[PDB]
């Protein structure tokens, strides 16, 4: 038999209403592992570059990670993949909670949607029984609201529902998919779902999910739980609480937000407020947070409880974790109470809480500069808060000016013209970045911003510390029990790294050290996204319970395939390279791989050129960022190299 994976996918043609269960090729598991990797294989060989994001031939894939549904702590992620309407590159998007384990218990690893339904429908899965249901009665309803109505309809209180809100139905380019306290948030995956006329995917599963080596697997799981206990008794010394332990950023538990409010830019990634965090602010936001927070709650099979139910007076309850706590507050120069209220609305509409606040702040800078007129904003209230609420509603309905803003800052400015493009100053590959505008070029971060296929900095960093300790003795204490490094050299790099002097950035770590660090950090993210493992226990925090040394053991005990540390590094390199190839085939080149012009005050063009040159070399790519025929062949990706040649992307010899 197969283990850990169920070995089956659902193929759904929404145009025809046909549904088919199909066995998967076990060879694909050995090569590409699962989750993101096998999504990338499917997209490569079924979605050629002439396919547009809202064409019926675009695929929307829901994948459960390889080890989802097994007893591994926190292994519960869904990976949604499609071609993004905003970036026109691959979009993959991760969702925690309970949905991917339920799909596994129902018997499936993926659902693959093609075509478009003429009428709004939802898909209903209960073990072997799969059917398309009319959803016209749900038109416009919020994503959580929709889940609750369906569960009552079907009499399935234990079913897990992934749904879009009105923003997804109206194809907003940053519409999300929502499931309880979890969100596939970014790249427009909710827009593609809405385009296909798909309101929700409802699943219930009550079958067994088997692992290959039972005692060895549960053994590894217990070792993880012991490490979690110990790690939480030993936060990283001198690191802020939101980042000192395990989990997603622990923003729902911590009230102190000095680091965020004083180092991140307010407005349209525009304004540093150096001394924002006063006594009055601290006490006022703590009062808001204490009243609003109902309970800290976990995803499936995890003790970390990063998320929270949030209850604002007069508003339905919703669920929140991590940075959207602050993004609306900050984009609108407001307070935490405003943040939590508008986030309720935006969560039900199903909007990305990273891009949406910046699109609205971008808007008001245009209105401000006069590039947009007051006549483009019919009935625009006086109050600033009320203006954000107003504009939110115009956007999710693609109404008038909202119709342009619904396309994101890149497309909206391009459409608007009149120097509007100057104010879309925070994009990479057409995708909004974190609102961070720092002083000194950071050579590690430079590489991650340029090359990251998620195009989001919080989803490629983590395993190497963000900053050096001032004192050698702190560095010695840190590297002491740092078992997660692939190689001793990572300890030595951190030991020499200093905040100031000849061993400080941008000149140290060296170019070769920076490439190695970025490669290791990224690799861990790709491994998480194939297995379904929450990055909260792996690739995101310092010193995680899951790492490159025990992951191969989880894969071998769980899935019953051969795995060791080298084979795993190579598998991660393989589908990370395949994701790169897919974007190359869609037109991406070195030219696209540059951070915003104003991202650092101090730039070093010769050093930046040498970093990207060396990093491409490490990856085994062209100096145009294309994977070479040699490295493709070595990875078992010869078919990619053959197609590159045939398409003129690579030159034969």
């Amino acid at each position: 038999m197969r283990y850990a994976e169920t070995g089956y996918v659902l193929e759904v043609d929404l145009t025809k209403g046909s549904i088919e269960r199909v066995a998967t090729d076990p060879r694909d598991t050995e090569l590409y592992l699962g989750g993101l990797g096998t999504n990338a294989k499917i997209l490569w060989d079924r979605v050629p570059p002439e396919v547009e994001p809202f064409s019926p031939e675009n695929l929307l894939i829901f994948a459960a990670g390889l080890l989802c549904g097994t007893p591994a702590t926190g292994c519960n992620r869904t990976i949604v993949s499609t071609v993004s309407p905003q970036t026109k590159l691959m979009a993959f998007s991760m969702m925690g909670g309970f949905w991917a384990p339920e799909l596994k218990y129902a018997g499936y690893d993926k659902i693959i949607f093609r075509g478009k339904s003429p009428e709004l429908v939802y898909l209903y899965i209960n073990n072997d029984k799969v059917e398309i249901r009319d959803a016209s009665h749900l038109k416009g309803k919020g994503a959580i609201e929709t889940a609750e109505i369906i569960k009552k309809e079907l009499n399935e209180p234990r079913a897990q529902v992934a749904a879009i809100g009105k923003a997804g139905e109206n194809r907003v380019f940053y519409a999300s998919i929502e499931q309880g306290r979890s969100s596939a948030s970014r790249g427009g995956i909710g827009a593609v779902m809405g385009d296909k006329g798909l309101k929700a995917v409802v699943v219930r599963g009550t079958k067994d999910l088997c692992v290959a080596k039972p005692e060895e697997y549960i053994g590894l799981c217990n070792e993880v739980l012991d490490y979690i206990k110990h790690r939480e008794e030993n936060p990283i010394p001198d690191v802020m609480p939101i980042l000192a332990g395990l989990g997603s950023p622990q923003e729902m538990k911590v009230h102190d937000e000095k680091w965020h409010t004083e180092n991140f830019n307010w407005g349209n990634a525009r304004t540093r407020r150096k001394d924002f965090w006063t006594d009055e602010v601290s006490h006022a936001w703590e009062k808001t947070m204490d009243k609003a927070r109902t309970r800290l709650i976990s995803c499936y099979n995890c003790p970390m409880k990063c998320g929270a139910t949030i209850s604002m007076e007069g508003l339905p309850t919703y669920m929140m974790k991590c940075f959207t706590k602050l993004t609306y507050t900050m984009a609108a120069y407001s307070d935490l109470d405003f943040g939590l209220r508008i986030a309720q609305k935006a969560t039900e509409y199903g909007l990305d809480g990273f891009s949406a606040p910046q699109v609205m702040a971008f808007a008001f800078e245009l209105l401000e500069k006069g590039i947009l007129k007051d006549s483009d904003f019919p009935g625009l209230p006086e109050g600033n808060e009320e203006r954000f609420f107003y504009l939110l509603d115009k956007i999710v309905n693609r109404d008038g000016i909202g119709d342009i803003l619904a396309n994101g800052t890149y497309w909206a400015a391009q459409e608007i013209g009149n120097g509007a493009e100057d104010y879309a100053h925070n994009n990479i590959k057409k995708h909004e970045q974190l609102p961070l505008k720092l002083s000194m070029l950071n050579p590690i971060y430079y590489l991650m911003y340029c090359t990251g296929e998620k195009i989001n900095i919080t989803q490629i960093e983590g395993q190497f510390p963000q900053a050096p300790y001032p004192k050698l003795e702190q560095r010695e204490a840190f590297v002491e029990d740092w078992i997660q490094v692939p190689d001793e050299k990572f300890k030595k790099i951190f030991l020499e790294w200093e905040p100031r002097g000849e061993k400080s950035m941008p000149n140290f770590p060296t170019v070769d050290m920076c490439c190695d660090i970025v490669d290791w950090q990224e690799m861990m993210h790709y491994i998480d996204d194939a297995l379904g493992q929450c990055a909260g226990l792996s690739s995101f925090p310092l010193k995680p319970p899951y790492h490159i040394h025990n992951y191969p053991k989880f894969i071998a005990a769980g899935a019953g395939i051969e795995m060791d540390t080298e084979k795993l590094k190579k598998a991660a390199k393989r589908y990370r390279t395949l994701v790169r190839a897919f974007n190359i085939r869609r037109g991406m080149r070195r030219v696209d791989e540059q951070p915003p012009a104003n991202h650092w005050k101090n730039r070093f063009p010769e050093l930046e050129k040498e970093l990207l040159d060396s990093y491409y070399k490490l990856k085994g790519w062209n100096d145009d960022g294309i994977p070479t025929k040699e490295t493709l062949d070595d990875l078992g990706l010869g078919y990619v190299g053959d197609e590159f040649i045939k398409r003129g992307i690579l030159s034969a010899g």
Partner: protein, 170 residues
Amino acid sequence: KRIVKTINIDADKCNGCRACEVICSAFHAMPPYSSNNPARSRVRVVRDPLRDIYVPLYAGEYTESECIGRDKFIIDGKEYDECGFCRASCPSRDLFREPDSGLPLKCDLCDGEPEPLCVKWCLVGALSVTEREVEEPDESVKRTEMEIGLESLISRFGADVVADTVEQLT
């Protein structure tokens, strides 16, 4: 004097993770840990984030009949489900019954193992089990799991049907 054990459940500390369903089902797979399946768990969590209800329920005594009337509580502003606190392995619902056979399930506190596994995997510490001596003699008729399983099939299907199927399987 005999010992009685109490499963202490602080529902205020529960976070709805369901790790407890994961480990109980895993351990009771055959062989142990070769699979898992929350629906085979002897601990089942009532979980509704929108009602703020998080209540671990442990499987209890088998009943071959439904009650004439089912109960449903509002307590402290919360609307609980019908029979929402019942431990019984009862024909009115799937809880505490094997999802493919309807066989009864019953918590035995991981009998024979060093410690209750749900409690061990509940790292926030919502669950604990304590013991105390009481003077009251145990008046329970102690039927085995094996005996309870078969007797339930015989009620549902017939003594001759069950016996015949068994002969044809051995």
